[PDB]
Design a protein around this ligand. Structure first.
Ligand SMILES: CC(=O)N[C@@H]1[C@@H](O)[C@H](O)[C@@H](CO)O[C@H]1O
Ligand SMILES: CC(=O)N[C@@H]1[C@@H](O)[C@H](O)[C@@H](CO)O[C@H]1O
Ligand code: NA
Lengths: 571, 571
């Protein structure tokens, strides 16, 4: 109820200091380096992708600042501070819709977006007052996993989409004809039967004496007269990249084989435990390090994550921090209630589901946890980031899970080679702080990531997407389609529910994935969070479609390993 | 004594028909398909490499003809049908020196080599008459593993090394730095301040008015015209290749990863076992299938394997069948006894050590073998090859072993995935025949391998090298010196033979390996076989340096498999 959220803080304050001294060097150092690089790339790409859309009033710097701020407060005042936030599809689409709505009565974007951001923030406060942890517990595995797994796959989907997309901006000579190598050339030249736009572009910009200069230009230079890249070395607007496409694929493919090699070192027998694990958690940093040397030696001009080195608010119509919201006539502010209310619901439900996925019996919880405090800290930080007109980041699934696995407490007497002991997972509360502090300080740090190529981070991302789901029981079953039925291990959840019913839960769950997939692909697509509601309604039905016993074997709330221990000790 | 190799044939007669009907498709098909390709490129690089050496007296086709016969007869008429007689170092150097010796008193090269070939054939005939078999016992695991490990290590190195050479002969740019890509050029041009060498080459070949040609000649034409390549894309003699390095590396890595993935699919569990196992054997065939297709589609010119379709003598002044030697001074033929005596010794020991390495009991077969038959068919094949003026071939290590490992019976009764029972190996002896049958018929066909570039054959080569060294006990151990003794792998040495004693033995084995290694690298390298002699002498000394019980564990002529059975049935 109202004033019952105090109990969360009271129940985490004795533990608060005790969770700093928990932290160690040689593990956290590595986790911080890993998450620092990981977290930086989506913020910048998102900031840019969003920059074009909301017409140059938002850019890399605005996303960097809001992201620094958010990370610093979240890692301090969260009742589950192990979620490492990252943007999602509803925000990106929502902003575009806000933008399309903001093409009439469009006197300031910023004042309208602060009014919308404030209404949804304050509403998130109204939700934590009433009924934020009075319904949350009604959920079960079907829906939480349908949501988690589907999202995780998109993580992989855009890792690949990122690579294939590059393939469009970097083409190749499709048959080299080396004998004709010395004949290859490409020069810029004037349009032949030129379009009006090229025509208008040339006239109104006033370029004098272009003929002495048109015989050969640099790559940027031709793009500014809009001329044809004519030659036998031109098959697309972008010249024929010799090697970027095919090196990029080598970087991409080598990372996903090598990164998996490094994380499985933990169970190797060739060393004692002390030099083993410590090679197996520097992994992402070593893969960044070696692909960096290979790229340095044999110089392919492969893309990198670039960050600007100039510090400013963009468009000269922003202060660093700007309070005023007067320009829109007053009524629009009142009219914003219906979108901000749809958003407070999508934001609320995203957050809470993600909290449910952290607060399972996987990634064991040692101490108590709070829903209301978690929601409180996103709601206050959403309100202030919106008050400074900066980008929003919401608790993402795969990021939280990989953050939680990198730092971890493990036994002092490990079995010879085989049988590593999980023995919990760490919560420090200081690397989350430092990551977003050091990424805040990287407005003027441009050298460190510029070298770090884009492809190696893309592999890191896809590997991340794959390894989060090794603990999600559903994917295991998804991969059981071509597998025979006598070939699996004991898997108690298989022995007392028929094969026909196992496949039948996988087909239906897969149907709702396919259903999500098409709603995501609609030119609206914001129904998706609210779809988790329907996945609960339908779920209840299924007790009658199939026996209640028949779901107490799969969705069963306690994890499969424990029930294997339990049922074997009964017999 | 004499006529004592007859027992081998008497012991190979009973099995004769049963070892064709033993033969089964898809485990033999795939092996043939991978080998056909593998063996042709091996006898093609050695025939063209001898061609430059013998001023075009011996050709690759002469090499194809000798190879087709050498293999065809051997797989019919030997005592081990899984040995493949490959293009080996000793031949080349012998032929060099011989060519160098036939510059004083060397009117004819072909007749002199044929006389030596008949003499060394003859020397193996008196050797094979008496005691070919008895002296085999003096060779043991020490020497054979030392010898073998080095050969496989070298083979792996020249897979990688050959690839480096391709990048060296098709030069690459350190940095493209794309903006100036379009600015780059290189055109052929007349030599300025011409060197005496190109001055001379130009003059005597009589090619007038090259100035009108040298505005811009093609890469092939300029590179044999000794003209200077002048431009910004020529830092060196030839323009930088856009795509050859990265495409060759993609074929190389890809082939090395997919064949080893596929070959371990036996111990994966995605399908019923019967349809599982068939896929793994053809994987080499599958890597070939898909890479030929991919290169067919988007082409990157890279060197491709061609064979002379035209069936002829070389230089059109030498008869096919040639003639019996007679023109040379009679005495030179008698003088050839000493070089040929040297040759016989090395040929007998090189042959015999490879045959010992195949006829291990960890390499056991459900059939016999005959050393004396193998030398005998080698001796016939050595005389006929020499009388017809063709290249000789001595037993190569990796080819014979990758044959053996590629086809092996393995049980399908096993538990799914892990533990596929070893159940001996497979010696049908019908694939060797079928390989060499198809390259014999594929001497006037060239269309088959013109569409397979070298790099993919090189990735096959790297897979051959890595997978081959399975059976070598020593290399396993070298890789266990890092492993501690807390959870050390089960090697017999820990309780029966002290770590100190295993180490002293491995260090002395390694020193004699490094000594065989420097000997190989020596500008003679005739001395490589006689060293094997020394490896015995040194073996004897240790009979006073150590108890004999403590060395019967790793140099046993009964495998570990038997010791594991014995020592487990005692306790
Ligand atoms: C900055 C620069 O080098 N510009 C060159 C110019 O010097 C040259 O005259 C022209 C064609 O000759 O190509 C361009
Ligand atoms: C294409 C061909 O076969 N030869 C061309 C010729 O037509 C052209 O005039 C010359 C440029 O001067 O370059 C070369
Ligand atoms: Na999300």
């Amino acid at each position: 109820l109202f004033g019952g959220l105090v109990l969360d803080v009271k129940r985490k304050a004795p533990w608060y200091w005790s969770d700093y001294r928990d932290a160690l060097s040689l593990q956290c150092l590595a986790s911080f380096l890993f998450l620092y690089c990981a977290c930086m790339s989506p913020v910048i790409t998102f900031g840019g992708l969003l920059g074009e859309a909301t017409e140059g009033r938002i850019s890399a710097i605005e996303s960097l600042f809001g992201a620094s701020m958010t990370g610093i407060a979240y890692s301090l005042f969260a009742g589950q501070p192990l979620t490492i936030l990252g943007s999602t599809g509803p925000v990106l689409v929502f902003e575009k819709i806000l933008f399309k709505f903001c093409k009439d009565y469009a006197l300031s974007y910023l004042s309208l977006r602060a009014c919308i951001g404030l209404w949804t923030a304050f509403l998130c406060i109204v939700l934590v007052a009433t009924d934020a942890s009075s319904l949350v517990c009604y959920i079960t595995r079907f829906t939480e996993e349908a949501f988690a797994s589907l999202i995780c796959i998109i993580f992989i989907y855009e890792a690949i989409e990122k690579l294939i997309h590059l393939a469009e901006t970097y083409p190749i000579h499709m048959h080299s004809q080396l004998d004709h190598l010395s004949l290859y050339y490409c020069r810029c030249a004037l349009p032949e039967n030129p379009n009006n736009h090229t025509l208008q572009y040339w006239k109104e910009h006033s370029i004098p004496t272009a003929d002495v200069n048109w015989a050969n230009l640099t790559v940027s230079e031709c793009q500014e007269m809009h001329g044809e890249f004519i030659g036998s070395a031109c098959g697309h607007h972008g010249p024929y990249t010799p090697d970027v496409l095919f090196w990029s694929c080598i970087l991409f493919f080598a990372t996903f084989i090598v990164s998996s090699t490094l994380k499985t070192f933990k169970t190797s027998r060739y060393f004692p435990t002390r030099v083993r694990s410590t090679v197996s958690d520097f992994a992402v940093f070593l893969t960044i390090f070696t692909m960096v040397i290979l790229d340095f030696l044999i110089g392919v001009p492969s893309p990198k994550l670039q960050v600007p080195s100039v510090f400013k608010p963009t468009r000269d119509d922003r202060g660093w921090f700007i309070s005023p919201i007067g320009p829109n006539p007053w009524w629009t502010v009142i009219a914003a209630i219906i979108p901000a209310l749809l958003c407070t619901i999508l934001i609320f439900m995203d957050q809470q589901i993600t909290a449910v996925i952290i607060n399972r019996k996987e990634h064991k919880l040692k101490k108590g946890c709070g829903y209301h405090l978690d929601l409180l800290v996103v709601a206050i930080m959403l309100g202030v980031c919106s008050l400074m007109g900066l980008p929003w980041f919401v608790a993402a699934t795969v990021l939280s899970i990989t953050h939680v696995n990198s730092l971890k407490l493990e036994s002092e007497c490990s079995a010879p080679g085989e049988q590593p002991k999980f023995l919990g997972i760490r919560e420090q509360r200081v690397t989350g702080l430092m990551i977003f502090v050091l990424m805040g300080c990287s407005v003027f740090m441009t050298a460190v990531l510029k070298f770090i190529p884009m492809p190696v981070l893309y592999g890191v991302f896809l590997y991340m997407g794959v390894s989060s789901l090794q603990g999600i029981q559903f994917f295991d079953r998804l991969k059981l389609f071509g597998m025979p039925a006598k070939h699996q291990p004991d898997f108690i959840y298989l022995r007392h529910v028929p094969l026909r019913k196992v496949h039948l839960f996988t087909l239906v769950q897969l149907t709702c994935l396919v259903l999500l997939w098409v709603i995501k692909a609609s030119p609206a697509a914001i129904v998706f969070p609210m779809m988790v509601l329907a996945l609960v309604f339908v779920r209840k039905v299924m007790d009658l479609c199939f026996s209640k016993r028949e779901l107490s074997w799969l969705d069963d709330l306690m994890p499969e390993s424990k029930k294997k221990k339990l049922d074997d000790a009964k017999k």
